[PDB]
């Protein structure tokens, strides 16, 4: 049951920093939906943000720009990951992210691991 | 130092590996176009692959699924990066990338840096 199995479904996922995204995969592989950041010590929290990417086979890549006309953290994030089933029936998306912002001293780029865990209705 | 200044413009970018991308940035700051991989020791080379993400201000994040109806590397790369003016009034995109794939051993993710330089026609 790897990514093809989400052709035309909403699915919600949640990471270890509390951030929650709901992604809409279409038959052609295209990902869209909203990302809600709750990672401590960060901006643009508790508000949904347009994400967009593309899943195929066992891999998904997706991107959030942290601007939505409500709060603008002047920065963008992209995740790349692989779907992985968990002991008991569950599934995760293990990912690496990169985060580009620009401040006073010019541009910076943080990177980290993010493991998203399927949540059911 | 602004992707906002790239609206309804198609623009070509190369990086230190010689990979090339043409990106189209709509009025809404949304991003589309082709990526051509040229990285030695990788798959899926010299063929265009769709890319998509969003640009706002001096930050962009975009994503490529490495399947295009020609060659399937069964992997997905996502970049996030800022715009950085160069001497001579040039513009470059500094970027951090994550490439996720399923190999014999299961599920790996590699990361790394990539600088893309604007090439006018
Ligand atoms: O600081 C900002 O510019 C706002 C966005 C912060 C989001 C980062 S993306 C990496 C990490 N994982 C999350 O879910 N949130 C933080
Ligand atoms: O290896 C694969 O499965 C497909 C090719 C990946 C190309 C990578 S993406 C990261 C780096 N940046 C490039 O311009 N090319 C390589």
CA gap A112, A39 in Å, rounded: 12
Residues 6+ apart with CB under 8 A from B64: A54, A61, B35, B49, B50, B51, B76, B77, B78
| Adjacent-strand bridge partners of B55 | B60
Query: Token pair 């198609």 is at which residue?
Result: B10
- Per the entry, the structure determination technique was X-ray
> Helices in A2-109 by DSSP H: which ranges?
none
B54 touches chain A (CB under 8 A): yes
B115 touches chain A (CB under 8 A): no
Residues 6+ apart with CB under 8 A from A95: A79, A80, A81, A113, A114, A115, A116, B98, B100, B109
Show residues of chain B in contact with A100, CB under 8 Å. 59-61, 80-82, 94-96
CA gap A66, A47 in Å, rounded: 10
- B10, two tokens: 């198609």
Phi, psi of A115 (to 5 degrees): -115, 110
What DSSP letter does each residue of B20-75 carry, written as one string?
EEEEEE-TTSEEEEEEEB--TT-SSBSSEEEEEEEEETTEEEEEEES-SSS----E
Q: Considering just the CA atoms, what is the radius of gyration of chain B in Å?
A: 14
Half-sphere exposure of A113 (CA within 13 A, CB side): 8
Q: Tell me, letter by letter, the H, E, C secondary structure of A11-22.
A: EEEECCCCCEEE
Query: Domain range for residue B97?
Result: 1-121
Residue B99 contacts residue B105 (beta carbons within 8 Å): no
CB count, 10 Å around CB of A10? 11
**Domain count for chain A:** 1
Query: Token pair 């962009």 is at which residue?
Result: B60
Based on the number of CB atoms within 10 Å of its own CB, is A33 exposed (0-12), middle (13-18) or buried (19 or more)? Answer: buried
CA gap B76, A15 in Å, rounded: 19
| Adjacent-strand bridge partners of A24 | A10, A32
CA of B73, closest atom in ligand 2: 3
Residue A63 contacts residue B83 (beta carbons within 8 Å): no
| Adjacent-strand bridge partners of B54 | B30, B61
Phi, psi of A59 (to 5 degrees): -130, 145
Half-sphere exposure of A120 (CA within 13 A, CB side): 3
CA of B101, closest atom in ligand 2: 3
Task: Please state, in angstroms and as integers, the Cα–Cα distance from residue A106 to each residue in A71, A102, A103, B84, B118, following that order.
Answer: 20, 5, 5, 8, 19
């Amino acid at each position: 049951t790897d990514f093809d199995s989400l052709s035309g479904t909403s699915t919600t996922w949640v990471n270890e920093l509390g951030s929650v995204m709901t992604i809409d995969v279409d038959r052609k592989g295209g990902v869209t939906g909203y990302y809600v950041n709750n990672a401590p010590g960060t901006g643009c929290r508790g508000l949904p943000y347009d994400l967009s990417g593309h899943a195929h086979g066992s891999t998904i890549a997706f991107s959030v720009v942290w601007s939505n006309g409500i709060a603008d953290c002047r920065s963008a994030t992209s995740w790349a990951g692989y779907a992985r089933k968990t002991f008991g029936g569950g599934v995760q998306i293990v990912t690496q992210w990169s985060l580009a912002f620009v401040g006073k001293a010019g541009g910076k780029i943080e990177t980290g691991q993010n493991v998203f865990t399927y949540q059911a209705a």
